[PDB]
Write a protein that binds this ligand. Structure first.
Ligand SMILES: *C/C=C1/C(=C/c2[nH]c(/C=C3[NH+]=C(/C=C4\NC(=O)C(C=C)=C4C)C(C)=C\3CCC(=O)O)c(CCC(=O)O)c2C)NC(=O)[C@H]1C
Ligand SMILES: *C/C=C1/C(=C/c2[nH]c(/C=C3[NH+]=C(/C=C4\NC(=O)C(C=C)=C4C)C(C)=C\3CCC(=O)O)c(CCC(=O)O)c2C)NC(=O)[C@H]1C
Lengths: 319, 319
């Protein structure tokens, strides 16, 4: 049961310290990570309402020009499909995805979700050969199914995610009822110090983060030294209030957690929730030594693997 | 516990009737469906040993020319990857998949699996826009997870598979302990007669088919009037014995079952096993009124959906 959040910094909220960090409003940082661009749009008319300041880098046109234009004009070939896929009242985790062409190498991957009356559109560069078929997940299911017990399932899950992603470290981090955690399996690059069997205080993943991670099952920091890029305007004009970004992987990471990652020598981090009977059971927690953008198709594969693993854990815990 | 099979027709076995059909060797028909091509190759040297008679249609070169050539020569860009993906002793259900270019429209999809010392290579045409992302499955998982009980899960599963495939009819067919079956959910085109709630004798899916369907989880008939195309030579030269084709979706369907489908007015059929605690629990059973080749990526998506559904059933039955 998390504490209520304080206002974010851009609304005069307090600075976050180790004394108050359970109240950081991590879902509304009003900014994104710089490896992609974000727009928000009215859910009915498709009018573009907010834009990340870096949008020209990815979209080819300046934020000041794009604002107020409709998606019906900007994305004539996707707007109907997008509307149909995300009707009013749909779950905020439901996503529409499409691949767009862009004057640069590879393509742009577009991911969209709906929060209330707002559509949130994420654009990130993707290379052609950076596709992952349904086979990745399909082939992986076999070894997960043959695991004879919970610990063996955990060991195969971390090895499989490391093989699929190439991350330097992949852990299964299990929560105890007091919200402390333990690394119960780990696949890692030879020579990296082991976190296997190590336990960590509840404060390392505070209660509002655990709540968020029960609703939105994947999040990441692509570069633990990269500065966030503001949304402009920072408030959603529909509401004159902050834009919820929990459902966007481009959401800026809490600075407190960015410092934690840097202190561990981590250049890139990603985790996927394992949710069992509606409760946060654990995380598939991944590190890389250097910045790294896991491709959208692979992130989606990892999400599905998380759901599979949650069901396999739920089956085994009943036994 | 199925009866032992008789020899196949091409080894002088008996004709199959309603009196002996539990002994039809359905896994070794020595032939494939005509919408793709099949080769078999030695698992170590990659020498091509058998070829479907129609291979020139898909590969551009005549069967008589391709035989005896090595995959190292024929597929220089895939042979190393293929070898690495399917090492000796790997599960016969494990697959390697790749998309090849071919002088015709779209591409060729290549699917490979290993049985003993043999590699079995299936080639089928696929269109560019016939790709299905990991998102299809990922988005589908939500409604399956929210289903409040087993029957509701069944209803959402059939509707979801019908939405993903466009099939005229999608059923969940559940086996009873006496191997009879019941259609426990059904999504169908308006106006088609309902099979919902109908029960069927065990003989409609005989014991050797149920055994096969416990190991190889997807099979189909793309055109219920299409004649099978022989493999040549029909016997695997490694063994001087029939080539097991259970793991190839291009395997020719039992003529008995083809007639059953025609009697039902079905033009195309596909099913996916639901396997719970290693036992065949049921099938996701699909019909179309006319011939139809579900694309490889969508078939793989359906496989994964079957595994997901099996785990969700297993979770709910425990409760
Ligand atoms: C006073 C505030 C604190 C704090 C805040 C915080 N932590 C997170 C998110 C995560 N913390 C994680 C912790 C671990 N990663 C590890 O590798 C290990 C052990 C080896 C642990 C215990 C993880 C996995 C996350 C999830 C994010 C990710 O996978 O990178 C947040 C939320 C970040 C966000 O989503 O914006 C916050 C606010 N952590 C602290 O220790 C104290 C100082
Ligand atoms: C004497 C032999 C018989 C026989 C053989 C047979 N049947 C199958 C495979 C299937 N039969 C299925 C039956 C149903 N489909 C339906 O729509 C309904 C009810 C509405 C039923 C009861 C199904 C679903 C299959 C699986 C294949 C598929 O999905 O199309 C085989 C094996 C075919 C193969 O894989 O080569 C065989 C040998 N069926 C008979 O009724 C008797 C005459």
């Amino acid at each position: 049961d998390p504490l209520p959040f304080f206002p974010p910094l851009y609304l005069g909220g307090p600075e976050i310290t180790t004394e108050n960090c359970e109240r950081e409003p991590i879902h509304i940082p009003g900014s994104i990570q710089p490896h992609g661009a974000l727009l928000t749009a009215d859910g009915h008319s498709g009018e573009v309402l907010q834009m990340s300041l870096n949008a020209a880098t990815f979209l080819g046109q300046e934020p000041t020009v794009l604002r107020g234009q409709t998606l019906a004009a900007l994305l004539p070939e996707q707007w109907p499909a997008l509307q149909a896929a995300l009707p009013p009242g749909c779950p905020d985790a439901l996503q529409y995805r499409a691949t767009l062409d862009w004057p640069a190498a590879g393509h742009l991957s577009l991911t969209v979700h709906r929060v209330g009356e707002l559509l949130i559109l994420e654009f990130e560069p993707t290379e052609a050969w950076d596709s992952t078929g349904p086979h990745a997940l399909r082939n992986a299911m076999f070894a997960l199914e043959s695991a004879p017990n919970l610990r063996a399932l955990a060991e195969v899950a971390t090895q499989t995610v490391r093989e699929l992603t190439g991350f330097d470290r992949v852990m299964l981090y299990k929560f105890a009822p007091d919200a402390t955690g333990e690394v119960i399996a780990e696949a890692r690059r030879e020579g990296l110090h082991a976190f296997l069997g190590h336990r960590f205080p509840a404060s390392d993943i505070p209660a509002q983060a655990r709540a968020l991670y029960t609703r939105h099952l994947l999040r990441l920091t692509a570069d633990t030294r990269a500065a966030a890029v503001p949304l402009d305007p920072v408030l959603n004009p529909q509401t004159n209030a902050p834009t919820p970004l929990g459902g966007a992987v481009l959401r800026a990471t809490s600075p407190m957690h960015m410092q934690y990652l840097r202190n561990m020598g981590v250049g890139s981090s990603l985790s996927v929730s394992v949710v069992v009977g509606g409760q946060l059971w654990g995380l598939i927690a991944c590190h890389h030594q250097t910045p790294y953008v896991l491709p959208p198709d692979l992130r989606t594969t990892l999400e599905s693997l998380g759901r599979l693993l949650s069901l396999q854990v739920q089956v085994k815990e009943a036994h």
